[PDB]
A and B are shown apart, each in its own frame.
Chain A
């Protein structure tokens, strides 16, 4: 499921701004 893919991804924590 897309949710399972999200939860296993490296991007579920707080996301830093870019610049």
Chain B
């Protein structure tokens, strides 16, 4: 019966998703609706800024992409994927896209501001999470991937840098730059080196099973404090990933190592999340035996910690970044390429 409820929930969620997928929102604000405050993070396409929406006084995180840089990096379709998908999804652990628009120079995605900082920052500072704390975060990713995959979406960039902690201590996934809706296999070389599945590195067709591999990398890094495969040169990271070998800290519980051997499985025909039982091989694993999946979804579980908050618009949980003045050209750049944005 629990499984049928999940089925019915995801069926209704897909009906809502497809309505927005087929009829995406467009041009729902403009730049001078916002006061720009501070850069929260940077990336190859641009930067994410803390902004204040003038008419409501709400704070948001505004992702800014330079259209010319997107084109140079061959990320046009990925960027169209990112916005089309983000404006259509709805889940507790996915950041909410509130507005989007473009101008002569840039694309803008305006998201709910998540004030607690990147999981990356807390994880590096504290060293490692306890297994209960790592389980709390991991359970949210499990449910988020069950949601995304049911919509034929593959996320493809799971890492602590992309997981934000909200004021309740829960996770918000951001950065859908590599998210893709696909029923077949796909082939694009993309992701982050430490998190790449072997079939990506080896240039095979791949599917949603790469997200479950990446979950194994995330859980490992959360509980160990370092990822299962690292080296100073990416090539050496890839050699470790495809080798089939993995070692675990001596403090890893027996259940945690068994779960990770089934997630960090090089053989697609054996990898948890890709078998006949789908995600239920993960949700029913002994390591998750105390996890109340509904309570997690409803945010009724006490969080490991609540991030510090001095006030609204406070960024103390984020690093400082060099500020650059947002310039808008007098001429429209790349209009045809981004016409649907």
Q: Hey, which bits of chain A sit against chain B, CB under 8 A?
A: 2-3, 5-6, 9-12, 14-19
Contact = CB atoms under 8 A, between A and B. Distances in A.
Interface string B213-248: 000000000001110001110100000000000010
B46 interface: no
Given A6-B225, A17-B177, A19-B189, A11 B74 contact: no
A10 B249 CA distance: 21
Given A18-B189, A19-B75, A19-B190, A9 B232 contact: yes
Contacts of A18: 189-193, 196, 234
Nearest to B249: A2
13 contacts: A3-B225, A3-B226, A6-B225, A9-B231, A10-B232, A11-B230, A16-B192, A17-B157, A17-B177, A17-B178, A17-B190, A18-B192, A18-B234
Nearest to A17: B192
A6 B190 contact: no
Contacts of A5: 226
A6 B231 CA distance: 8
A19 B177 CA distance: 11
A11 B177 CA distance: 22
A18 B231 CA distance: 16
A19 B75 CA distance: 9
A5 B227 CA distance: 12
Interface of B: 44, 73-75, 120, 124, 127, 157, 159, 161, 177-178, 188-194, 196, 224-226, 230-232, 234, 247, 249
A7 to B, nearest CB: 8
Nearest to A18: B193
Given A11-B232, A12-B124, A17-B178, A6 B192 contact: no
B192 A19 contact: no
Nearest to B234: A18
A17 B192 CA distance: 4
Nearest to B230: A11
Among A3, A11, A12: residue with most chain B CB under 10 A? A11
A17 to B, nearest CB: 5
